[PDB]
Write an enzyme that holds these catalytic residues in place. Sequence first.
Site, PDB file in Angstrom:
ATOM      1  N   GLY A   1       0.807  -1.216   0.000  1.00 43.04           N
ATOM      2  CA  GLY A   1       0.000   0.000   0.000  1.00 43.04           C
ATOM      3  C   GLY A   1       0.838   1.263   0.000  1.00 43.04           C
ATOM      4  O   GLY A   1       1.976   1.227   0.464  1.00 43.04           O
TER       5      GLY A   1
ATOM      6  N   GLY B   1       0.559   1.979   3.844  1.00 43.79           N
ATOM      7  CA  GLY B   1       1.225   0.880   4.529  1.00 43.79           C
ATOM      8  C   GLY B   1       2.725   0.919   4.353  1.00 43.79           C
ATOM      9  O   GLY B   1       3.465   0.613   5.277  1.00 43.79           O
TER      10      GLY B   1
ATOM     11  N   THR C   1      -3.317  -5.541  -5.113  1.00 41.64           N
ATOM     12  CA  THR C   1      -4.187  -4.372  -5.366  1.00 41.64           C
ATOM     13  C   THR C   1      -3.550  -3.312  -6.360  1.00 41.64           C
ATOM     14  O   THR C   1      -4.250  -2.420  -6.873  1.00 41.64           O
ATOM     15  CB  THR C   1      -4.669  -3.697  -4.033  1.00 41.64           C
ATOM     16  OG1 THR C   1      -3.623  -2.930  -3.426  1.00 41.64           O
ATOM     17  CG2 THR C   1      -5.281  -4.687  -3.030  1.00 41.64           C
TER      18      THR C   1
ATOM     19  N   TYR D   1     -10.523 -11.352   2.278  1.00 36.04           N
ATOM     20  CA  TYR D   1      -9.650 -10.733   3.283  1.00 36.04           C
ATOM     21  C   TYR D   1     -10.085 -11.109   4.699  1.00 36.04           C
ATOM     22  O   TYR D   1      -9.242 -11.299   5.561  1.00 36.04           O
ATOM     23  CB  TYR D   1      -9.605  -9.207   3.145  1.00 36.04           C
ATOM     24  CG  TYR D   1      -8.733  -8.722   2.011  1.00 36.04           C
ATOM     25  CD1 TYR D   1      -7.515  -9.332   1.731  1.00 36.04           C
ATOM     26  CD2 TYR D   1      -9.096  -7.620   1.255  1.00 36.04           C
ATOM     27  CE1 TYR D   1      -6.710  -8.888   0.689  1.00 36.04           C
ATOM     28  CE2 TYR D   1      -8.293  -7.157   0.222  1.00 36.04           C
ATOM     29  CZ  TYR D   1      -7.104  -7.801  -0.067  1.00 36.04           C
ATOM     30  OH  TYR D   1      -6.330  -7.337  -1.107  1.00 36.04           O
TER      31      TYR D   1
ATOM     32  N   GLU E   1      12.484 -10.647  25.446  1.00 34.44           N
ATOM     33  CA  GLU E   1      12.853 -12.048  25.339  1.00 34.44           C
ATOM     34  C   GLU E   1      12.668 -12.533  23.889  1.00 34.44           C
ATOM     35  O   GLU E   1      13.402 -13.418  23.476  1.00 34.44           O
ATOM     36  CB  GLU E   1      12.059 -12.911  26.336  1.00 34.44           C
ATOM     37  CG  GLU E   1      12.815 -13.263  27.612  1.00 34.44           C
ATOM     38  CD  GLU E   1      11.986 -13.586  28.853  1.00 34.44           C
ATOM     39  OE1 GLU E   1      12.579 -14.015  29.872  1.00 34.44           O
ATOM     40  OE2 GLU E   1      10.749 -13.394  28.818  1.00 34.44           O
TER      41      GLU E   1
END
EC number: 3.6.5.-
Lengths: 431, 427, 430, 431, 116
Positions: A135, A138, A171, A216, A246
């Site tokens: 994206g 994104g 997309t 999705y 950790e």
Amino acid sequence: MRECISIHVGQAGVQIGNACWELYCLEHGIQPDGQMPDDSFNTFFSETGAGKHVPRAVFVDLEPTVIDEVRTGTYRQLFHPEQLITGKEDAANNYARGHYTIGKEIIDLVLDRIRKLADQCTGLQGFLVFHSFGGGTGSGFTSLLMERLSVDYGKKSKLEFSIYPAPQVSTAVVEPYNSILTTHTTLEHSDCAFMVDNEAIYDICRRNLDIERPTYTNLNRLISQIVSSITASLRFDGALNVDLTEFQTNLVPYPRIHFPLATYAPVISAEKAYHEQLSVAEITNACFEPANQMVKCDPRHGKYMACCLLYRGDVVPKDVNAAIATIKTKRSIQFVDWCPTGFKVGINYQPPTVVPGGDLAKVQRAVCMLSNTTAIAEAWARLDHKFDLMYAKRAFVHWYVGEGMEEGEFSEAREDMAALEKDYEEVGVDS
Amino acid sequence: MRECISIHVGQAGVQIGNACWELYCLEHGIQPDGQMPSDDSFNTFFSETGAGKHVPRAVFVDLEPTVIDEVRTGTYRQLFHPEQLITGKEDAANNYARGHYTIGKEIIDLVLDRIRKLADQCTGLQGFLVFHSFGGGTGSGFTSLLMERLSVDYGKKSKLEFSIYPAPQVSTAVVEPYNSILTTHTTLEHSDCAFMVDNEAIYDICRRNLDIERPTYTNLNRLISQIVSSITASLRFDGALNVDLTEFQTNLVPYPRIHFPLATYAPVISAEHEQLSVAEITNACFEPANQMVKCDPRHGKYMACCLLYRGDVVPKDVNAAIATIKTKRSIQFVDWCPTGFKVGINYQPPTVVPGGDLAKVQRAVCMLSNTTAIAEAWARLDHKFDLMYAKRAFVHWYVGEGMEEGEFSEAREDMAALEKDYEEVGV
Amino acid sequence: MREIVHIQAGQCGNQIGAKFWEVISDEHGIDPTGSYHGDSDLQLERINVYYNEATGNKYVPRAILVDLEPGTMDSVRSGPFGQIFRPDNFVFGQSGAGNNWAKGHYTEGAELVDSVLDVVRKESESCDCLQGFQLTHSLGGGTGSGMGTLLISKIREEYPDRIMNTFSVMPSPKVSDTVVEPYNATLSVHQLVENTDETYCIDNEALYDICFRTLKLTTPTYGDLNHLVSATMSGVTTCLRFPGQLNADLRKLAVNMVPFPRLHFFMPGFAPLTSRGSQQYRALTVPELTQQMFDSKNMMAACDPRHGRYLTVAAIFRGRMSMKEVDEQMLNVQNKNSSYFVEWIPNNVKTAVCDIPPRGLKMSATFIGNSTAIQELFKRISEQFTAMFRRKAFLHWYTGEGMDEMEFTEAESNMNDLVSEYQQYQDATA
Amino acid sequence: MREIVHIQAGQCGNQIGAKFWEVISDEHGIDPTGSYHGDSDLQLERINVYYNEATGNKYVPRAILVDLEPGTMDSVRSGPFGQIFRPDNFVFGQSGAGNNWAKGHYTEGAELVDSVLDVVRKESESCDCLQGFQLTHSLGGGTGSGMGTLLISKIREEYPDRIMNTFSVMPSPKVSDTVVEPYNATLSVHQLVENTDETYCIDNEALYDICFRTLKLTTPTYGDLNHLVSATMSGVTTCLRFPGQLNADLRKLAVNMVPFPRLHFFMPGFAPLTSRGSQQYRALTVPELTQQMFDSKNMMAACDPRHGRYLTVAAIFRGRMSMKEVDEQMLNVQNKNSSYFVEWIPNNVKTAVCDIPPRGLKMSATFIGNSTAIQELFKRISEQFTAMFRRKAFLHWYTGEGMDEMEFTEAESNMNDLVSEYQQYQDATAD
Amino acid sequence: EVIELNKATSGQSWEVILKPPSEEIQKKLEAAEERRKYQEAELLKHLAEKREHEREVIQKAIEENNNFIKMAKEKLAQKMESNKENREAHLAAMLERLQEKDKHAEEVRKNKELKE
Ligand SMILES: Nc1nc2c(ncn2[C@@H]2O[C@H](COP(=O)(O)OP(=O)(O)OP(=O)(O)O)[C@@H](O)[C@H]2O)c(=O)[nH]1
Ligand SMILES: Nc1nc2c(ncn2[C@@H]2O[C@H](COP(=O)(O)OP(=O)(O)OP(=O)(O)O)[C@@H](O)[C@H]2O)c(=O)[nH]1
Ligand SMILES: CCOCc1ccc(C)c(Nc2ncc(-c3ccc(N4CCNC4=O)cc3)o2)c1
Ligand SMILES: CCOCc1ccc(C)c(Nc2ncc(-c3ccc(N4CCNC4=O)cc3)o2)c1
Ligand SMILES: Nc1nc2c(ncn2[C@@H]2O[C@H](COP(=O)(O)OP(=O)(O)O)[C@@H](O)[C@H]2O)c(=O)[nH]1
Ligand SMILES: Nc1nc2c(ncn2[C@@H]2O[C@H](COP(=O)(O)OP(=O)(O)O)[C@@H](O)[C@H]2O)c(=O)[nH]1
Ligand SMILES: [Mg+2]
Ligand SMILES: [Mg+2]
């Protein structure tokens, strides 16, 4: 104490965030209105004087339509309006617009909302960032956010859950450009990143859940089970727990080498009725089957550097130790010569929760393995190849240069990926 | 009147002191409360209060409280004044340097003040009798510090020791050979006469003559106390041989450094047999099985020989016994000393502790001989010292307490000179 | 020399520490409320060594519980004897150490150390005659290793005159929690060589092998390993807890067992080796007890004693037995195995006998040996350390806390010197 | 990204523009008065993209009607939906352009352009989030071509941040005997290459051939040609007008379809090809629909796609059909015709499916292809241009308006460069 | 030969001869105390150097974190500045091209007037 702030960026980040927080609510018995009729769940949920349990999360997107569904949905009361941040127009699948042109307009507001959440923490562990590689938001906005978080929170741990692109559910044609650009920019700011190949999840839904054409929602529900297994060690007080610190210390031998391969078992269709419950040995052995991996690659022709086993449900240490003892005697699982005791085990007593109206079957015990393998460099090789095909002709590059980027940033990012692939080759070489 | 002050240092010194004073009380008819319903001779060891209480002219000292605390709460708690029983907070941890330098410096002045109080009650003090182990950190370290200070404060007074020589069968520390050589070196010029008691000899006598499979310190101490009592009987009764401390030096010590007499006692009979004659007990004096120190006088030379009898003994029988020993045995004296014996007889028979292991006898004898064979005991101890010191094993514990590594070699050189002195006198 | 102050750090330290207090409380007749419900007057004679007497005639362990995360100490509090401990003595953080020695020693643990020292100081001041400290911890983690060694350093500075004794659990790949255990262990050993007087080396490699091979447990757990550790800890402290001819104290033990200051790492041993819960159907004879305690199979440090020589030994027999027979057997062992004891330390084997046997056994024997064979344990950690350090693997987690690569090189170098020092005395002749 | 401002210039532009509004108004349930009389809630969801909401709950097209002669705009006003348009949005001259590009661009049209920009400005300011502009026009005349490209230039200057999209009708001697059409088209293409982001190439040569050959209309009229144009325009704007998975906007289309800025001329395609006011007695299957839209007979530009390669493709299927079947058929087409898709642009065919079918059809498919075969269209115009320019035929019409022969040489040169650039990527290989 | 018969109430003694013959302390204690005191002083100074190193470690960790923030602040300022310069230049060039078109259009209209 020991709080974790989740940041969901762009459509993939937000929609996965919906699936995760819905699952967390079911696991902890929190209603969609925030009412909860252990205390470890406070790492992810704050509490108001009215007894309301609110997620320590921020949802950000440059377009309003995805977050608007959260604002009007089932869980609208769960989030404070200030946690859901939207812009006017998206990045139009362009990294340069998410990072500069559009992103610059909302970055300060996002950081202020994150600061408000951080002020409510008496011992913040770090951040969990959910986003797609493909994206414009994104990729572009996440990079910009990660750089700003390193300035405002220094060396505070930042973990990513990144959606790696697949042709079956893509997309945009420029997803390989956005993936390499964000990977390059975010590399020095991320401490540990869990990649999720959409093709691997798509295949798992088709093969293990008999879904002819996964949506999705199908993909996200499966992803949320894996994210839940990773975070269960922070949200529950089990027999053996693993904090964020950790995870990093046990999984990341070198700063750049921070991409663990996630594997989950068992993934069974709800429609199956004769399957008797799988033992700790059976589900542990399934973690070394490529059919159960989150990223498509072949660990059998690679070397392990770290191995973390996160169990949940009816699991006792005696059975886990027996299962790990047989894995150690397997020649087909090769560790690097510089890693003497490669295992970290965690056990959480709470069994796997399944969403009502979901595709997954309820199981007595499950496990998620996080392994650091040189084989994951296959995912980079495939993405870099797609990048090279287009970049050789400079196809679509004008869209990025039009937004103020320089053509040099493409080759700088690609050179970094070539160096990263070279780093995975070198760590596998014997001393 | 001539008084004697006894000083008991450390666990061995204190516990032996308990056995000795218990025996002295029985011999003189003194009760545990100090009352004596009854001979002024016992006043050399006991003072008297306005209430008629007979109190030992003794001081008990230890760097840790638990041994002396048993005396404070025991059967004879009323016998001693609280000031005579002196304790510290923590012991010398089997370390000479810790007892002599670190911990000992904290209590030395207090001990000397308590001794000065006893000395002030004397109208003619003879000297001191010091009881201690060679192996203990206190018995070794604190004793040598005390002896040096006593030589400064009481110059012309005699100082006699009763020293417990270490044995593997009843040892308490691996560093005992270090403590033994260090204390021996430091105390040598301050001691006039020292009676060594090898714990291995006493242990074997208890096993062999008293049929005790595994002897305890109470068993060992009761036997030791009989020998100490035989030595000191002449000072506590109207005797004629060894009537004062200086006479021990005169009769037994020809050379100041060679001051370690070998004690032998007979008879040692189990309480569980017709009475043994003067000849039988006298012949037992020349048997190595009856010695207080393990060594072989037959392969050595005598410098002096003292025979101390107790009980039903007449000179005619003693003289006859000695005459036959001369014709039957090869007992070699040095060419510069007369081949002979000083004989003492005390008509008072040996006293035995009720509930003890020893049988009551009509007559007994203790021989004190200064023989060069005792240099075997030094040789054994020096060898153990050499084995460890060659690697500097444990030496850091002593250096940590302020002692210098040079003191080890200085002490060892003195022992090598002492062994050489016995060879020069016995060749 | 009377009171000992016990400290337990990190997950391992608090797990074996809790088991220690459960075991000795049972022996001394102390129930989980702190009340004495025993029979023998000998149970109370030296109870002040480990317990403080509180109002209501209660006995409270002189123990301080430490951890950088609340988890383990909540489990201790909820345990069988969890209520016996002084609530003010639980000192914990919230952050955790993430199995990072640098976090425990320099950053997270350094912020908590002063809070611990306040509790130590409060306990120390209530002692008539404090002999020293006893620390239980692992060397593979971050809290027990990093913060535990920081505590030792701070305690040595404030109480230089007291004995510092530790029960140190050594890591093994056979029983592992983190990949960085060899780093944490090397950095800890570096501290222990300098700042402890006596260290009992409890090797997880040895405990696993005993459970697997001897006790035939196909899958040994920490509970199975800890049964062997609690048995050892009970044995090794019997002389301190019960009246005996040996007036046992921490300093006298160091003086007689440690000929050279750096060589203070002991190889403990136990006989008979028993499994958790399962009932020993037969009593072991004195000759069997002697043979077993000197057997490599019975050692709690994964070292073959026959690969070195004993500098010094302290053996303790528990139960009603012939002291004549114990003496004969001990002498026999030395005469038959003379080549395994240094000739230059005369009478280097001390034996003690306690009438009180442990729970479930009519007779047992505990062994404390200062053997040059312990170099095998350090060589094992060193090999594991080098394998990683040569590739600078995981180093960024330590340098991220401010550490320098110099510190790793120095800790490795000091441990390599410790190994060559043991080898020097193994070759030394009379 | 919501509102689009539509502009229609010249006779052709207004004729196809009126037909566009008639077609989409029917689909959205809007009657000639502007009242909604539909049934589906989906008809109104994205109505704001093309319509403004007026008092009395009326819907008014965001359309601006331009022409240099009053004739066509009187015909529009008197047409079926003529009363739906905002009367203030009719901007017209009196002079006409006489099929002279120079008159529309430099003289008569330049005097009217400011009046048009005033109406554009008024419409644009009433947009919450203006996406851009959509212009309908022919390239052969003088107003649509000349004034239309002048408008594009002026709008670009004032709104450089918005998308410029055009529906450009290409001339053909089969349809019109006006000799100067090759001059006007070359002069217009010269402008479009520089100032538009995306252009749909609607070729009158293709529309005539479809009517004549396929539809068997011996004498095709503009009404017959415009039926094919209105079918195409309805199809290529379906994604903008109706809710869908593809969050369709003008910028995202350009970003994913245009790899090189100048190569933004699309070849539209439609299936099934139908005649005016004619009832379709049979429904076309998914495989038939797929085969037809990739066939040369179904292209709205007179180019054989098999003579070039597709850089990128966007398909839209309309009607209730199996999405599994659509996916299988699209995959089959790519696998069987792999040599017609460039190898160096991974994942270069995108498919969308809309449940709402067009009027008169139970199912249909629209195709948008960026093919290098479009160079055949420009070569055709160029050959016609040269034939005239070599003789300087009709040049006095243009120089009489102030133009120089230099401008003709430059426009021809730029179009020749455009052709060679398409050829360059046609010949380009992955290796 | 028996000689020297000595008698007393508790017993008697004699001899039988078979054959004749042929500040300084205080100085040592104070010198040892100075050695112990010196050893302890040097050990506590060694521990003071340890505390100094501990300070240096935790402060180095702070300094690396500050440098990481500083370089990331500079890198970001650099990226956003280079991007603004580039966007400014791209738009400036676009407007200049359109200014040239307006200059050409005026020339065309001027040329039309001259042709009359
Ligand atoms: N697993 C999963 N993948 C998703 C989801 N939504 C989108 N993707 C994937 O993410 C990539 C596209 O990025 P998006 O997140 O949709 O877009 P964005 O981040 O909002 O960016 P712009 O809309 O371009 O500004 C593709 O690989 C998609 O298949 C989702 O909910 N789950
Ligand atoms: N015969 C005898 N020897 C004893 C007695 N107690 C201890 N010993 C021996 O003395 C030596 C050790 O000296 P200890 O007297 O116990 O110790 P210490 O002198 O008090 O000094 P510290 O080391 O400070 O405790 C060993 O050889 C013991 O076997 C006892 O009562 N009788
Ligand atoms: C004798 C076995 O005791 C085991 C043991 C465990 C724990 C402690 C603290 C002690 N304490 C202790 N106080 C004194 C001693 C002591 C220990 C060992 C020795 N040694 C071993 C080498 N040669 C000796 O005489 C001599 C004395 O040991 C003793
Ligand atoms: C596929 C449906 O396209 C019809 C269509 C018509 C008009 C417009 C403005 C749109 N808008 C639009 N928004 C997003 C896209 C879009 C179109 C094509 C692609 N491409 C083409 C090559 N590989 C892709 O993923 C990716 C995204 O197209 C879409
Ligand atoms: N024997 C034993 N070892 C343990 C136990 N718990 C953890 N360990 C070991 O301790 C090491 C890890 O240190 P740990 O104490 O868990 O972490 P810390 O809390 O950071 O000190 C590893 O070598 C583990 O195998 C336990 O109960 N018993
Ligand atoms: N397809 C189509 N082409 C048209 C239509 N009307 C005119 N044309 C074409 O448009 C071109 C002439 O431009 P035109 O729009 O009539 O003149 P303008 O008013 O000066 O823009 C020629 O190629 C004609 O064939 C129409 O309604 N449909
Ligand atoms: Mg999106
Ligand atoms: Mg003592």
